């Protein structure tokens, strides 16, 4: 059956991202004898330039790492908020939710950190060799996709008028950057090649890698962030406001390490990260699940999925965050979960409806009753960054960064990027799991995964897509499971070619955090008589353009025969597999 | 608009091929600094382990080169017939048509003396560096496309039974190869490896590609080819038959360079192999083409097109070949195809109808009459090879290499590949332009392409298909050229996604040279309201799968800007580009 790139099969190495600059540059790592961790180091560096309105260097990364022999293990990427961001001095500031915009929605930045971590323990090449990539982009250009222009066009007049600093780097002589001519930042490539000069002779690999650490840490660019936090700058509030990050809250935050949140479902195990992230909620998808499928594709296969996402999605409202200590355990017990599935009804659910793990009451913030109405805000993503790689020796790597992105934070003027906004997450009202809580990462949509077959590592994959992240991937983990074989392997791109669909009944993880109750979100090519058995049932069904659904990537091991595999997401003509 | 993959565009490297193994494989030769000539070689080899059923290391190529300063250059790397052989033995046989398989039907191998003259004239890598891909997929394996086993499949009575050295290769144990599991051809591995050891000597790096050179032309390589032509071989008459090919005919046989046949049009230059091709016949359909044009993708636009290429195959069939002089100028002049498109009409030619150049009487063969009936042979190509290349410096390549094909000929058994069958396009019957000839061109099927804008190289191109090849590759071309700008650049993918089709109304290059007189196949996915207004016009129109008519390859420059792109055919999950 016609697929729009083939399910890639080879024995060198697999890389899946999206942005096939990033894709090549990561493999061209791989050509050149590096691992998978070393490529994936250098195309986060690519995506960076290459999906500016996407992510940036101040944003974040949850890592998922799977080493050829051992323990799947996750790097968390995610930064904290600052020592001085309570719900107290927000709400003195007369807010009711985190800015959409602006330092104050700022966690500290976490990718960076993650990344030299990422490339000290588990991989081979000098911080030179595997950025150069990436400086090559940023001093002598790229041709763009046509939505970085759009986004920043989205922005004209805040750029201009007040962001300043964003101003001279997107629109130099009031030009947005066009399809089809190269786009430059000459400052970021600046900032890498200082950072590569002033580290240059710090040591052996390893020395050069923390030395960068403390560069980004306590150094000069830690020195720049700072200074542009306390920089009053306008955001969506209508105000100027400061942020209240310091020289301290990034001198002290490291990326640290953890067990990846697990589940087991039928043969396989899902890895993802823990319930700091919404990771979970795709567990919490899985065991809803009966043993019984309906019909793979069908109304019915739709209508349980669709419901038994709402029903996870509460829970990851009412009990997911990092202000608190969140009863997951309990959550994928099978005890819970039988007692859940029976809430799938015949009829599609308007309620927002949070279980009770071992009898505890849940508690919601007061917005999670809002009503999202209209259409929604542009969307940069229309048709987050991801990639995977697996390497000859069968290390797996899955990416999901973001954050730091140029239409929300006015560029910090010396380094050429800006600060991100992931604290626009969390609640400005205390003692919830998710409250604004200084020192805790904000409930993070970034979700990658890797998923076992009998205990081995066999498939990496992720999207972008803030809350639609952990559903579309659902929807494909159960495709390549339940599809049959493509020439001898997993169909991972029949899975992501296939029509994909989201909900958006729950509150959303961006300012300003509405809900559509209800409200599920098909592409044009599913069968039209699904949309209208939905209908039937009480669904709000908007009718999305045909190839609009997910952004998926994903790389995979054969472990009887050793074959690497690959596939990528066809929407957007954006996202690309490569490698042999 | 939505494209199966994207143009991509970059500033390092572009390559296409109908292989994801090659291409990448190519590419990693650019990643190690190699230049367009080096990374074609390297594919081309990768090739014929990854692509055996549709070439191999005996057959030939047409390569196209456009260095980036100077001119557009053509390596013609088909063979000639043998020294003895003539329309006289071969009648002596009792043949009417030389047979579609067996060592009658092979050329002096042209491909792989092409491939060295290309690697010492204009590559930068040693032999050792450009084929240790090929050679690490011939030994330690790599997963096929189903076709491949199909195809063995398909001749599996005649290997077991008649080519048992096929056999050996190809049903170990009595096992056709199968998608998801490794498939090696030990021997040839060990080939490349011997031919490797004995050349490393040799001295400097052009010195090892002219002793490889010898070794393939005097050494052990053509003992064993010689040893295989000369042994009684079943082939497609039923009866087992011997070749001519000798010792002497390969010592004495080069590839040689030469001058493209051009044809401006509309601002581009098309540029092709001579007329012991069938590439001047893309040439002729443009110069029939009237000044002003139909609606791009209209009913009309079509018919104009299947009538003029009618037109142009007409004049291949009576004046293409290497024994006589063809009467290029004169087919290209403007009086000429003046007088031709006067014989477009309303409706749709059934009949054969070659021209007069200079007043002179066409000549065809005693079979150009005959007609094909039924339905067709295996087509391995079903849902030859090619390749494109473009570099940092601007080097351009296309090539389309083929022959040597695995379900055509026994395998050489101390090589692991067998001899191509090219000599099944010629004629037995003398005085022809196509007559079989000893010491000249079989007039062949492969016809890569080079695309000129303003006389500056833009674009190199090409497809498999046989008879198809410029037919596809013209609806192709002036789709680049009428279609839209995407991403502020060639709209190389939608050009190659868009419907395409071909007509079969001349006589077949490929053993038993059937014509169907006025039958066109369109894809499935071009308006039915065309293919109902064709059949109103008079053509026997058959409605082919939706994914079915085309495997494009295309690299591009854009001359202002330095960036380069590429596409490729989603068409067989197969063809794929990679670059940045």
């Given at each position: 059956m016609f697929t729009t790139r083939p399910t890639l099969q080879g024995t060198f190495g697999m890389v899946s991202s999206t942005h096939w600059l990033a894709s090549q540059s990561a493999m061209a790592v791989l050509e050149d004898g590096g691992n998978a961790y070393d490529a994936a180091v250098a195309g986060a560096f690519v995506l960076h330039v290459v999906e500016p309105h996407l992510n940036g260097p101040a944003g974040e990364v949850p890592i998922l790492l799977a080493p050829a022999g051992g323990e799947v293990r996750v790097l968390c990427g995610q930064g904290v908020a600052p020592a001085g961001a309570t719900v107290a001095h927000y709400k003195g500031l007369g807010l009711d939710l985190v800015p959409?915009?602006?330092?104050?929605?700022?966690?500290?930045?976490?990718?960076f950190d993650a990344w030299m971590l990422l490339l000290r323990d588990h991989g081979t090449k000098p911080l030179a060799d595997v950025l150069k990539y990436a400086v090559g982009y940023a001093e002598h250009g790229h041709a763009p996709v046509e939505n970085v222009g759009v986004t920043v066009e989205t922005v004209r007049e805040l750029f201009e008028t007040e962001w300043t600093t964003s101003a001279d780097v997107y629109l130099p002589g009031g030009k947005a950057p066009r399809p089809g001519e190269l786009l430059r930042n000459p400052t970021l490539a600046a900032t890498w090649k200082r950072l590569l000069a002033e580290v240059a002779g710090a040591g052996d690999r390893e020395a050069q890698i923390e030395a960068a650490r403390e560069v980004w840490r306590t150094g000069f660019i830690a020195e720049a962030l700072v200074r542009q936090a306390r920089r009053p700058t306008m955001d969506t509030s209508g105000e100027r406001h400061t942020g209240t990050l310091t020289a301290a809250d990034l001198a002290g935050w490291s990326a640290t390490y953890e067990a990846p949140a697990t589940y087991d479902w039928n043969g396989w195990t899902v890895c993802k990260a823990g319930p700091w992230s919404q990771g979970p909620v795709l567990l919490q998808q899985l065991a809803l699940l009966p043993p019984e499928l309906p019909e793979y594709g069908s109304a019915d296969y739709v209508h349980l999925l669709v419901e038994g996402c709402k029903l996870a999605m509460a829970d990851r409202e009412a009990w997911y965050g990092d202000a608190a200590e969140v009863p997951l355990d309990e959550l994928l017990s099978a005890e819970y979960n039988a007692g859940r599935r029976e809430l799938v009804g015949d009829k599609a659910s308007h309620e927002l409806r949070p279980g009770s793990p071992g009898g505890r009451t849940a508690r919601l913030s007061a917005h999670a009753d809002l009503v999202a109405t209209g259409e929604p805000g542009?969307?940069?993503?229309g048709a987050t960054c991801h990639l995977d790689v697996v390497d000859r020796w069968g290390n797996m790597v899955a990416a999901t960064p973001s954050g730091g992105w140029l239409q929300s934070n006015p560029v910090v003027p010396e380094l050429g990027f800006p600060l991100g906004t992931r604290l626009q997450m969390t609640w400005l009202e205390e003692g919830l799991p998710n409250s604004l809580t200084p020192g805790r990462r904000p409930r993070t949509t970034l979700t990658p995964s890797i998923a076992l077959r009998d205990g081995i590592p066999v498939m990496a994959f992720g999207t972008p897509g803030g809350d639609q992240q952990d559903q579309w991937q659902l929807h494909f983990f159960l495709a390549v499971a339940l599809r049959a074989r493509v020439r001898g392997g997993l169909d991972l791109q029949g899975a992501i070619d296939a029509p994909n669909w989201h909900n958006d009944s729950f509150p959303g993880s961006f300012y300003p955090r509405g809900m559509r109750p209800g409200s599920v979100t098909v592409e044009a090519r599913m069968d039209p008589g699904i949309a209208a058995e939905l209908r039937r049932r009480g669904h709000e069904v908007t009718v999305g353009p045909p190839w609009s659904e997910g952004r998926l990537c994903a790389v995979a091991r054969d472990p009887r025969t050793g074959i690497l595999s690959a596939a990528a997401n066809p929407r957007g003509m954006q996202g690309y597999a490569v490698g042999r």
């Open positions: 959409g915009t602006g330092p104050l929605a700022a966690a500290v930045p976490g990718a542009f969307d940069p993503l």
